Amino acid sequence: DWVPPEVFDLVAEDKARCMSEHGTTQAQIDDVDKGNLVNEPSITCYMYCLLEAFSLVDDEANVDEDIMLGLLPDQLQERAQSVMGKCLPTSGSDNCNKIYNLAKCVQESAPDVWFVI
Numbered sequence: 001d002w003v004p005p006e007v008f009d010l011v012a013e014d015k016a017r018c019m020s021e022h023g024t025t026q027a028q029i030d031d032v033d034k035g036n037l038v039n040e041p042s043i044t045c046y047m048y049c050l051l052e053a054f055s056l057v058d059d060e061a062n063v064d065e066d067i068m069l070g071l072l073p074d075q076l077q078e079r080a081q082s083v084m085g086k087c088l089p090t091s092g093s094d095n096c097n098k099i100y101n102l103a104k105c106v107q108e109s110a111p112d113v114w115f116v117i
């Protein structure tokens with residue numbers, strides 16, 4: 001498991017805030033974490049929200065690739081550059097839909113490393 005245990009407490013405050021703002025359930029998060037996602041704002045806006053909280057996207061859901069790479073471990077760098085080559089730039093009807101399209105693209109491209117918190 002590439003995910004470090006320190007991240008969980010780090011994201012806790014923003015996670016609670018993002019769920020409250022968007023009407024997100026933990027069941028929805030569990031579902032996307034397992035690779036199942038639909039274009040429901042309560043989960044897609046949650047994903048945008050948490051990314052934004054950690055400066056991974058801007059006000060139009062453009063991804064900050066350098067920040068993203070900075071967060072991932074060494075054994076994931078080339079894979080990430082490859083996945084971002086396929087999945088960026090983001091597109092969609094709004095910020096939440098941009099993140100929906102991104103999620104699927106990434107989950108489809110790297111299912112074994114996918115996770116959502």
Ligand SMILES: CCCCCCCCCCCCCCCCCCCCCC[C@@H](C)CCCCCCCCCCCCCCCCCCC
Nearest residue numbers: 007010047050051054071079080083103106110113114115
């Ligand atoms: C190569 C595989 C890619 C990763 C698989 C999907 C996970 C992507 C998660 C995005 C950031 C993950 C980094 C979390 C671990 C970093 C630990 C460092 C601790 C200090 C920083 C803590 C915070 C900066 C964590 C930020 C967590 C944000 C979670 C966002 C959840 C929604 C993501 C789904 C949307 C698609 C992501 C699309 C972005 C990914 C493109 C390229 C890999």
Ligand SMILES: [Cl-]
Nearest residue numbers: 062063089090
């Ligand atoms: Cl982008």
